Structure 1
């Protein structure tokens, strides 16, 4: 399990063309000699990686490698229930994933990384771990995917990807009404909340009772 962690750290560091490198070097020195994952503050395992995607001044290629590594991290399923604070780890991963930004570059295209982010969001949402997230971050995820789908300026195939991903997310949202009983018992509900409190969020990614 740890072998993937040091291999990805080595690959990203030598991709960095030898401040953010200090975190990865600290991660490597922490796990240079540690057989099997132990009490390690598993949020701290991922914490150097989310600094790459969260920061706005990083190049497109580096954040693309970061997103690919994160997708590998989820796919091999190393952050399990045994690893303590895994709920916070996945929460931080999604929260940093929503606010991903970058600077344009000739290497690759923005559409590639901006599709990797959406696929990683999908694989997080339909996974069982998606049950354990919060309403604020998942509403932010929905705002991000709505902004991706609505924006006609982006590539059309990316828009189709966003639409299909949103359909899958809608399945995973509305399927959970079955497992939860209605609030109250036959109370005389009187509507008072507004019909326009929530509004569409403008795009921010790309080139430039909540917390329960």
Structure 2
């Protein structure tokens, strides 16, 4: 459970070091902070995801590292390590979807983020998002679908996942 966390940080840190030759300081802080403890139940889950949020949010970094970070988040929500028992999981998911809507960082990362939005919103945990965040989500998938410059297959990815989130949203009128 904690092995996978510093596993992911090891992978992203060595990728960053290979690519480079401000984020690594907090990354090693995450490494040292998660080294000691046994189980995640002691501490909050916003800080463990926070370096991933910082890398994915800002646009100064190329597609390799942000693709690796998005695959890391995919592994996170696939393995369900950020469980409801963990403290402040609502805030962690809210921050994840708030940062993820900014489609900034060629076309691989767009499909990775929109698949991640599908996996979050379709899941029951996606019911905990706020109205502003989910509205921004709908805005960014609409921007992806509307575009013509982008590849058409990415457009069909946006079309299908838009259909999915619309179904999930409109099921809530009961």
TM-score computed with the length of structure 1 as normaliser: 0.79
**1:100 Cα deviation from its structure 2 partner:** 3.5
After superposition, give the CA deviation of every residue in 1:103-142 in whole Å (9 maximum; x if it has no partner).
xxxxxxx111110000000000000001110000000000
Report SS of the residue matched to 2:112.
helix
Q: Which has the larger radius of gyration?
A: 1
After superposition, give the CA deviation of every residue in 1:73-117 in whole Å (9 maximum; x if it has no partner).
010001111101100000000000001311xxxxxxx11111000
| Whole-Å separation in 1 of the counterparts to 2:31 and 2:43 | 13
**1:35 Cα deviation from its structure 2 partner:** 0.8
More helix by share: 2
| Whole-Å separation in 1 of the counterparts to 2:12 and 2:25 | 12
After superposition, give the CA deviation of every residue in 1:17-51 in whole Å (9 maximum; x if it has no partner).
17100111001100112111133121001000011
Whether contact under 8 Å (2:41, 2:85) holds in the other structure is no
Q: Which runs of 4+ in 1 moved over 3 A?
A: none
Report SS of the residue matched to 1:81.
coil
| Whole-Å separation in 1 of the counterparts to 2:92 and 2:140 | 20
Work out the number of aligned pairs and report it: 170
> Where do 5+ consecutive residues of structure 2 fail to align?
none
Whether contact under 8 Å (1:87, 1:133) holds in the other structure is yes
CA RMSD of aligned residues (A): 0.9
> Where do 5+ consecutive residues of structure 1 fail to align?
103-109, 178-212
